[PDB]
Write a protein that binds this DNA or RNA. Sequence first.
RNA 1: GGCGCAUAAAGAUGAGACGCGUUUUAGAGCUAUGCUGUUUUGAAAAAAACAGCAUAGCAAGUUAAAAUAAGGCUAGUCCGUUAUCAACUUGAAAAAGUGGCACCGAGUCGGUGCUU
Lengths: 123, 1364
Amino acid sequence: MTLTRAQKKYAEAMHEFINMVDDFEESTPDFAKEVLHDSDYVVITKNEKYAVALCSLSTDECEYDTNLYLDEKLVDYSTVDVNGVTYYINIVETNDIDDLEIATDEDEMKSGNQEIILKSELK
Amino acid sequence: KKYSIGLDIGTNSVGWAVITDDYKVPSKKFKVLGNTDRHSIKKNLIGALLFDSGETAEATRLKRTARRRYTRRKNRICYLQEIFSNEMAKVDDSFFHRLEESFLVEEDKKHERHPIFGNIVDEVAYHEKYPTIYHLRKKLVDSTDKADLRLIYLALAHMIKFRGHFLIEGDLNPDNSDVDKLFIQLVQTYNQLFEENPINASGVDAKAILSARLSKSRRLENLIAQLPGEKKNGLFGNLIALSLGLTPNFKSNFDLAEDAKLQLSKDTYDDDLDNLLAQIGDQYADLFLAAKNLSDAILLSDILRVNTEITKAPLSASMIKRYDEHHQDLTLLKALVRQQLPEKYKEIFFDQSKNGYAGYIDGGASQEEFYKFIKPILEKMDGTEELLVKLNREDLLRKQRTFDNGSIPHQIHLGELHAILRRQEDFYPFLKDNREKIEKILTFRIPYYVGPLARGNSRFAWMTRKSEETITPWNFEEVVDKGASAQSFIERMTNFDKNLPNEKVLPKHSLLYEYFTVYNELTKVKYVTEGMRKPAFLSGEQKKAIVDLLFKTNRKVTVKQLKEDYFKKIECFDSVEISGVEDRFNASLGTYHDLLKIIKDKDFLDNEENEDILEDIVLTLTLFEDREMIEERLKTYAHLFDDKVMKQLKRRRYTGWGRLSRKLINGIRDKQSGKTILDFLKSDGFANRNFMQLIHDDSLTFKEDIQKAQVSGQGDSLHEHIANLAGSPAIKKGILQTVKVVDELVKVMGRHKPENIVIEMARENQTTQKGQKNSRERMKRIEEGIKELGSQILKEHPVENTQLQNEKLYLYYLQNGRDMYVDQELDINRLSDYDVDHIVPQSFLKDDSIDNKVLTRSDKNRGKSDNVPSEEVVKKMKNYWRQLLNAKLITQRKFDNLTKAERGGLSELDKAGFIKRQLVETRQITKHVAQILDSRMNTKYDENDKLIREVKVITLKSKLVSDFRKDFQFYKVREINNYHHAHDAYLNAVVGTALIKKYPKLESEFVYGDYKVYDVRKMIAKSEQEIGKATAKYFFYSNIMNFFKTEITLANGEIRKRPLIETNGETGEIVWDKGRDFATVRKVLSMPQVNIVKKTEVQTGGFSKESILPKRNSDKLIARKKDWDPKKYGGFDSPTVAYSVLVVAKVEKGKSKKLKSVKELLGITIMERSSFEKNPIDFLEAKGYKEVKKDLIIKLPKYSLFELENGRKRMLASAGELQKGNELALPSKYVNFLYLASHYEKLKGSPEDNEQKQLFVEQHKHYLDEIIEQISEFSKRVILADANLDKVLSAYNKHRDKPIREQAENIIHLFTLTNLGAPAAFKYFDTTIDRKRYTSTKEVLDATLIHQSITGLYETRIDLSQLG
RNA sequence: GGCGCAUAAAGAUGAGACGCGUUUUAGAGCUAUGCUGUUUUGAAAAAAACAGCAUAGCAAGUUAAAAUAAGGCUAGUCCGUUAUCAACUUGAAAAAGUGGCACCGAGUCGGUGCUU
């Protein structure tokens, strides 16, 4: 009926998507609702999943030499098929502080390989 | 010392700035409490308050009504259990106990494991005999022998938990569920609306086509093949498309601008619907509701498919048919995969993670995700027939508990519930006594008017009772005082009027409200008969004739029917051109024709006596949904209506509320004529005004009569007064925080009051900043203009909307590839030298709009007049201008500007318009903020009845600070730092106090109060420049912003230079010292110390993230109940810390468990905050801190600002995560350079000063190296991102030879390393650089805490290293 | 800025109901081999499974119960995510109260003098 701020901000985010790529049918994933709440970003990549962006945590003023960590964390990806390509609408939560893990050397290439069409924040 | 205060109110920011006579912000050494050794901080009295947005209350309303509906459903279950419990304890002892603990692990479960039937064998035999519960339910309906009682409880409890929508009222007659009747109702609605192109549905068979077994789109096109044909993309075709479930696109049917897709089955339908209804007019919402209930009728006949074995269970038989066809297609597809694809069988049926079938059942994956997955690998296989037609119809492998059961009406559950209860009543006399009890547990809906069934303790309830006991659905009738509950419902759920409070508004379809809106449209229609050349508006008897003739005959009347039935038929005129209405009358008497076709009596509705009868009828239909309180609030009106219209008029519904009230339209009267607003809009005489003019007319009494009521709507407390405003709770958070800032700030300045509070507030914006939502309607204007005129341009030079932010190109297209000045063709390759031309110049009003800017070849193809150019220009181009206006490229405003010299020139009312459109402000909420501030700051009454208005709270628009910003190069870049709130506040203060010193004669237009009625007829000259120092006129050049300038560049190249040191005329005091005031302002916009405060709020909100995460062996999870340990049951995760408190106590450290003194930053969640503030040292002893010191606990919310070595400021954001608390001050030369270089093409001005500024860009290329030097010298101090700074230095060095526009835009991207708040990842040229998070929280506790005030002028610097 | 038709748009709060969704348990998973597992004839292993754990192959797979913020006291078929919220001094709480000023300058505010 009336919807939450989290799926209101998603609603203009996909509305900013549906106009400027092409015209298409089969629009909706639109989502599970409880997953839209606890995810910080709605990115949309082209032909691939949002390979997770990454960060580093400086720890007790003796931060070691370039240990990268996955600040984001993909929770749900769902694809829309705009006539030729497969745009991956994917809502991404951040990771908290205590549960960061070390990212491998492949993922540092993937974020530079990406083509972020639209990253729209939503709390 | 006199002073002023400038205020910039926003949603996320309040900017505040204090100025003096000489425009300097002050400089006042402030005392600092606490225990650090800095005892005096010098601070500038400029700054801002930063706070995250005030979230609206409807998310809580969603969660609260969800809590209520879960509690009501649990109590329906408990009602059925307290019925069954006696003879259940006769039959099975702990059955309801086992269903109560069905959730538990076998160790926690203190009975047997199997809920039904107890032991191991009987539960297995139960699931073999009844594989779903619809088998159980389809057995208990279709049986005659007895059944087991707990098994009957399972059936009935599944009936009364999941009971379907109540949305249709009565029973399942074929008038609201047989889709022939629903489709012919939609056709009746469509022909009732249009009546030109009316579609004829005589021979269609909507049941056997729209309900038969087929795919959805194939189901669609058969129907349009039946009727003689509109389109598959017409309105009715897309409307049937909406009615079937597949998305139509309505932008072609109504010819809108943007793409608007309405899917019915989405979870965001009815908001996409009403923001489509905003573009189309709300006469279509009945057509779209007919679409929706036709869709539920179709989809109901899509679930229900059992009609041959019609035996009393049309749902349960349908779901066991769907179970059995699910089962046979599963065996078919499993055998077919192992036949033809031996690989992708483990990836389909054992998968549980990749949208396969095991993801469709065991895992979490949708239906349409599964069909997008399995449509390829079922298109691929060899024998796959009737496993694709039931995929295109969405029915292979379809579940029972799907998303589409939101269309089952509750009467189906009632029908087979009734059947279960009377098949079993012979064996169980227990149910022959309580069958009406059970059906009343099912079909009881707490109505809208009753509300929450509280007993005084709610904040939300208006239940008043006719007894005192527990309201169960049995005795809801003889407990609830329904008349008084409905009356309190009316006074809770009416709405107060905005410009006449303590009054109830009308409903949106009130009959006199429709008279009001028809007169508010007809007051601005002007007709030109053959042979007078004077457009005159309609008179009194002419309006009476047309309203009594054509509005009361047809619903919507267009201009053709207007002229045909009135000027052709009554006035007998062959053609009379009609001005104000474009194609159709926007207002319509929809309520009048609805009530005329309901009660079949025109003579009853033409009476003026029945208006209270009809308004009570419309108010009853608007407020109430319920059949009982509509039939009883119309039993008063059964005296007039012959009992078959009463069962017809009670069906009629409305929604929404009108903007106005009855005491404001036909209510208050003028003392000179006794005429209401409706009486003026019928017969105003010669000069017909509209409603906004009648309430903005200081001549008439009506604005003062509004001011008579605006005194009453003001609570004594501040918070209720702000709650009384109209706006978002974000902007109301901004208003309340700026009042906090004003009181705190006048407490700062010697406890004196200011001389001025200047306000601007431009917020609550949802226009997407007009970057991509605008260019579509730009091309819409272009293409329908070329459609109407018929001369092709995009057969020769097409440009798509990716390039149409260029304004000169758009002006090229709107004048048809020609020039509006001389009959010329604009050369397309040489458009770069063709200058930008205004019509009303930059010395008459500052504007950058299309209705003022035009394009032409030379500078003076225009003429030589400072007005709209000469009569030789406009008479010669009068042929082409009518041809281009009648195609609608350009506005009637711009045509009237280009036909303003033919009527002499600029009148007094014309320049009065040009000074009203820059000085006064039309949105209500800015006037209400001014009302708050001058009602709180000007409070001394005198011996008379007048408030001595000492502090003139004065209102700017945004364009005044905007062109003071752009024209004098005080350039704003948001992305550098958060100082631009405060610098916008300072420019607010400068422009406001300079306009109130130079122009005190206009304080009756933009200061709140009731000042003199002396208008601007005498303060503008009727001719050129007046005499020196005795000029009664203010300025003949109707621009207000001129006196800041030196040059006044006219439209004739002249520099009509104004004096250097400005003075006031009425007193001879200097208002603006051009030699040093711009030096003062540009020095103030280079303050390095500006009070940026992040408001330290305690996080109020949800307990955690609410995705229930499965059984994991972690500690991080939250138990969902107190006895459900997440190591075995799973639960929520990530508790939100409300505030991270500090503990200086002793833990048992080491192997010997020594009480070692620790200082740790403990996190207090929202779940635990109440138990914390109950007894905090008791909880900290419970947590594992010993000898806790109750005085030595300091509360730190989110955004609690610390300060570390060397001026490093880091604001806390979690239990152990920091943020960047430092701002980056940048001198104004660098900010001017970055704004010019990052807007190096889109300057939008004459190329003279654009060449000036472009040479200023190209010569100061050293500024880019200086800025990156400065960001490096900053981030080596207060950011300490070593590797990130080295990445951006190397990436700066590689792209050093790139052009200045791209390099400037990427340095404005580069500033995200140093902004306030959370660290982010930002795209410099290709190096998308990873962020760094500040998770070291052991560096914080040794460092200075600062307790900033609400403006930040008052700091209580607590040092934390001094603690133990 | 986005004055977008010189007019100025429409704003919050609130009541009811369904539908899913998510989580755990219940829907005895079977066969084969390998390991822990106990006897027989025991003078040590040799096998008669009885259970538990791995790896393959098969068997189905749709449903229900519970919960849907922890919970709270006022015990209601109510309430619990909106506004509010810097310290410090009073006050139970609401609420009230607390901080000197000119000038020269500026790198996140400094300095001088005056006054206390």
